[PDB]
Amino acid sequence: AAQTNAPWGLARISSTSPGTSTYYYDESAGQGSCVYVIDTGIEASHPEFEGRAQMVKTYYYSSRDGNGHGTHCAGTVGSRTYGVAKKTQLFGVKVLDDNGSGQYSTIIAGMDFVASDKNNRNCPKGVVASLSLGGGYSSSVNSAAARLQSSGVMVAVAAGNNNADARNYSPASEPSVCTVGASDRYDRRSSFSNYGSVLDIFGPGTSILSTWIGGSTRSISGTSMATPHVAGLAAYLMTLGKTTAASACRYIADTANKGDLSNIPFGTVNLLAYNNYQA
């Protein structure tokens, strides 16, 4: 399948080269997979979600996304126009308040929730969780992410936006999850992206167009925008049967575009998420 005039990051994930504008992907499109977006919520009513999104949990007075961040991230996973996996099911877990903030104990509860809740959902092609969030190092937060991954969920987490080594941030620093850095449309490391040995992969993160609250769209930047590219890619590849939740980070790294990014510090992988789709 080909989507013309796609956001640059979608085109990038299906290309061996920067500078193109059409996204190519197998029409299965993540059907039968599920992606949890653990964030500020999801505006499931947005026409871009086509009924495939729903809120499943909140720790606040509403399940609505009063911020936009979680809606944007969910859009990059699975919206019709802005998403990688255009037929996946999206499940929102609101662990962050409408200012984008949340306590670690709430974040941990939300990860444990997903590990159980997937047993209440139909996801025959597998389960992914996208965590576009983080703070300072916490062994408890890392352990929650490790348990979620161990339970059979492909956990993708943002590296962070400190232009620093991700070892000092959680859940970025958890070894067993997929830690995602950001790149720009010219194949540069995004200026804010964290780096380090703990990174597994980069994805598009500078100037990413996606859904926003109020039925709208906007372009924003962050490792929070790179993460859902990778989460959606995982869901897509799991529907294709190419990999599994336990192995998908490794598979994505094995099949990535290698050595194409600039300003990658020595000792950080130079790997850009790539679907290897051949029409």
Residue numbers in the entry: 1 to 279
Question: Could you share sentences copied from the article?
Answer:
Here, a series of new methods are presented based on the use of a low X-ray-background film as a crystallization support and a photoablation laser that enable the automation of major operations required for the preparation of crystals for X-ray diffraction experiments. In this approach, the controlled removal of the mother liquor before crystal mounting simplifies the cryocooling process, in many cases eliminating the use of cryoprotectant agents, while crystal-soaking experiments are performed through diffusion, precluding the need for repeated sample-recovery and transfer operations. We have previously shown that the transfer of crystals to X-ray data-collection pins can be automated through the so-called CrystalDirect approach, which relies on the use of a thin, low X-ray-background film as a crystallization support from which crystals are recovered by excising the film with a laser beam and attaching it to an X-ray data-collection pin. The CrystalDirect system enables the automation of sample mounting and cryocooling and can contribute to closing the automation gap that currently exists between crystallization and X-ray data collection.
As an initial validation, crystals of proteinase K, thaumatin and lysozyme were prepared in CrystalDirect plates. These crystals grow from solutions that typically require the addition of cryoprotectants when mounted manually. The CrystalDirect approach provides a robust method for automated sample cryocooling without the need to screen for cryoprotectant agents, which is often a critical step in protein crystallography.
